[PDB]
Amino acid sequence: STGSATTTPIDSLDDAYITPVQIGTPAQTLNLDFDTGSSDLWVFSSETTASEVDGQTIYTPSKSTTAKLLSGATWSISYGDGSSSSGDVYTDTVSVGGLTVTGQAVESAKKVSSSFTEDSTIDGLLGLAFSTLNTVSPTQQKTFFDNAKASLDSPVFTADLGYHAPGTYNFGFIDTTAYTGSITYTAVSTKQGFWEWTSTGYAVGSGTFKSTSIDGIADTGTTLLYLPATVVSAYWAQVSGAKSSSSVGGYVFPCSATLPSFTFGVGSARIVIPGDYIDFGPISTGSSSCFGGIQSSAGIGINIFGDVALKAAFVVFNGATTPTLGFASK
């Protein structure tokens, strides 16, 4: 089997992407944030504290003839941005782009933190990291990809995120029309539960490539590109007026600037992030200070190849017995 679904930016900055997901019988369609940096499929639901729902579409398990309470199971997750959610668990039928999993754990939110409530466009998350990170207790549950894998034509999914435009998540096949050149595959460590890999270096604009190993994670659920402070300083040094602002929380730059590109290495291959992809717009409405799309990871503990980086590429998440990642230009 295969599946193919369009993923759409939630706003004009590409702050996140939503993909429609069918849950239950009859189908209830929710727009979920596919997140290769986590491993829980959770939704706003009829059980979510009413004051914490503000425009999201909810899953109502009592209206699904295939929903079953997973007795005793609870979940609770906290994300790198400080947001969180928790609740109980049902199993139900979940379909993405024509690919159906029966018995998928659907984690129903009883509580969500303010940032989720405040984002009316995201009805939940669909985790695509390794199932060892799944938070369901006392019986850890499998991701949608893990459950579908055996049925797929090939044990892979691909992320093709658009810049200011829709893109595609495919399951079970590699669309050879969706990229240019060849796909370069690189080793993955699953020891932390992430799609963790090592970039071979970077370049700023038309500058020379610096060969240096940068361990980080391919994370579709993180908006920006978080790299070591040395790398980020070298980038922003090429932008007149750019500075790190403690009050704003990162590098800012004059909105009048033209940003240079940023290149990262995948083996001997190179992925070029155009400068425009690094512009996240005014820090506050009407400001002429703009927020940078490349930020320091120094306070995180891990480098994160988020959407800024991934949307410059066609990315293969290869869930073969030994997982690997593939990157192609497009």
Place of tokens 């050879």: 176
Residues 198 and 289 in one domain: yes
- Domains held by the chain: number: 2
Residue where a domain terminates, one of 128, 156, 174: 174
Residue where a domain terminates, one of 174, 189, 208: 174
Half-sphere exposure of 312 (CA within 13 A, CB side): 24
Question: 330 and 313 in contact (C-beta within 8 Å)?
Answer: yes
Half-sphere exposure of 211 (CA within 13 A, CB side): 3
Residues 65 and 123 in one domain: yes
Task: Report, as residue numbers or ranges, the catalytic residues.
Answer: 35, 199
Edge-to-edge strands, sheet with 243-245: 243-245, 250-254, 289-292, 279-282
Residues 88 and 151 in one domain: yes
Half-sphere exposure of 118 (CA within 13 A, CB side): 5
User: Domain span at residue 84?
Assistant: 5-174
CA dihedral 252, 228, 184, 3 (to 10 degrees): -60
Place of tokens 């004059």: 254
Residues 9 and 123 in one domain: yes
Return the H-helix or E-strand segment holding 33.
strand 28-35
Residues 27 and 9 in one domain: yes
Nearest to 253 by CA among 265, 263, 240: 240
b/e map 216-243, b = 16+ CB within 10 Å = bbbbbbbbbbbbbeebbebbbebbeebe
* First CA to last CA distance, the chain: 25
The DSSP code sequence of 60-111 is: -GGG-TT-EEEEEEEEEEE-TTS-EEEEEEEEEEEEETTEEEEEEEEEEEEE
Question: 150 and 319 in contact (C-beta within 8 Å)?
Answer: no
Residues 156 and 188 in one domain: no
Q: Taking every pair of C-alpha atoms in the chain, what is the biggest distance, in angstroms? A: 60
Q: How far apart are CA 39 and CA 327, in angstroms?
A: 22
CATH classification at residue 231: 2.40.70.10
Question: 232 and 294 in contact (C-beta within 8 Å)?
Answer: yes
The DSSP code sequence of 162-189 is: -SSS-EEEEES---TTSSSS-PEEEE-B
Strand bridging mode 294-296 / 225-227: parallel
Residues 11 and 156 in one domain: yes
Residues 135 and 277 in one domain: no
Peptide bond into 282 cis (omega under 30): no
Looking at the chain, list the stretches that DSSP marks H as alpha helix, in order from N- to C-terminal side: 114-117, 144-148, 229-236, 307-310
Neighbours of 37 (CB within 10 A): 24
Task: Give bridge partners of residue 19 from the DSSP assignment.
Answer: 32
Residue where a domain terminates, one of 142, 157, 174: 174
Residues 326 and 212 in one domain: yes
Residues 116 and 32 in one domain: yes
Structure-solving method: X-ray
